[PDB]
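Sequence design from tokenized structure. All designs in this work follow the same two-part layout: the structure record, then the generated sequence. An example of the structure record is given first.
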């Protein structure tokens, strides 16, 4: 079968002292979000957008397409690919570790994604023990939420900043699934660093105002020097 293509890169102009790792959504590659993040780039930030492997998707009759893990249903009560989410989480952890040996400590790295890409970001951030700088979760949800105990998660990533964005006309990942997610997030990490933003009229895509809010979030958490 096919090999793992190299991630799409938005290289830093000056010495890269911070990095953003953004996971694309179903059926996509990293190339579209690479050109999106390049439009709001900062001099000292490296932007990595890895590609998901092409694999059969149970939701659409096992028709193969880029997918970080199997999708079985579109509802909060749906079955989830527990094995695949955990396995894909280790790949993302391995990708964060490849940048810390490039001279960028994990605490200067934001892990984000769109839709199932965002869902993997939230699960990876809340389970890894690498301290990260923040999470940009776009039109996504929290997978395997029932597997988290009911108190704070504790550990290296207890007060991480999370910016969750969602549109109120999204027909694929509805707003309710994002609200259910951020409410569970507020009980796992310090809710003072959790910001939820709703975009009226947006569907399962991105808006210009959202990128502006993503940029303000990354700039605040990864300033120069």
């Amino acid at each position: 079968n096919m090999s793992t293509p190299l991630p799409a890169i938005v290289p830093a102009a000056r010495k890269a002292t911070a990095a953003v790792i953004f996971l694309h959504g179903l059926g996509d590659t990293g190339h579209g979000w690479a050109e999106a993040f390049a439009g709001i780039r900062s001099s000292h930030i490296k932007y990595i957008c890895p590609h998901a492997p092409v694999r059969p998707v149970t939701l659409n009759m096992n028709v193969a397409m880029p997918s970080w893990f199997d999708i079985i249903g579109l509802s909060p009560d749906s079955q989830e690919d527990e094995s695949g989410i955990k396995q894909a989480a280790e790949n993302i952890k391995a990708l964060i570790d490849q940048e810390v040996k490039n001279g960028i400590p994990s605490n200067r790295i934001i892990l984000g994604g769109f839709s199932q890409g965002g869902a993997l970001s939230l699960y990876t951030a809340l389970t890894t023990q690498q301290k990260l700088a923040g999470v940009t979760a776009l039109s996504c949800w929290l997978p395997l939420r029932a597997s988290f105990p009911q108190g704070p998660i504790g550990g290296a990533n207890r007060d991480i900043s999370i910016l969750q964005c969602h549109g109120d006309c999204d027909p694929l990942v509805p707003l309710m699934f994002g609200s259910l997610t951020v409410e569970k997030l507020k009980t796992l990490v310090n809710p003072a660093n959790v910001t939820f933003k709703t975009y009226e009229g947006m569907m399962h895509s991105s808006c210009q105002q959202e990128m502006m809010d993503v940029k303000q979030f990354i700039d605040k958490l990864l300033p120069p020097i």
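The helical segments are 31-38, 82-100, 116-125, 175-188, 208-221. We note this feature because it recurs in several other targets discussed in the main text.
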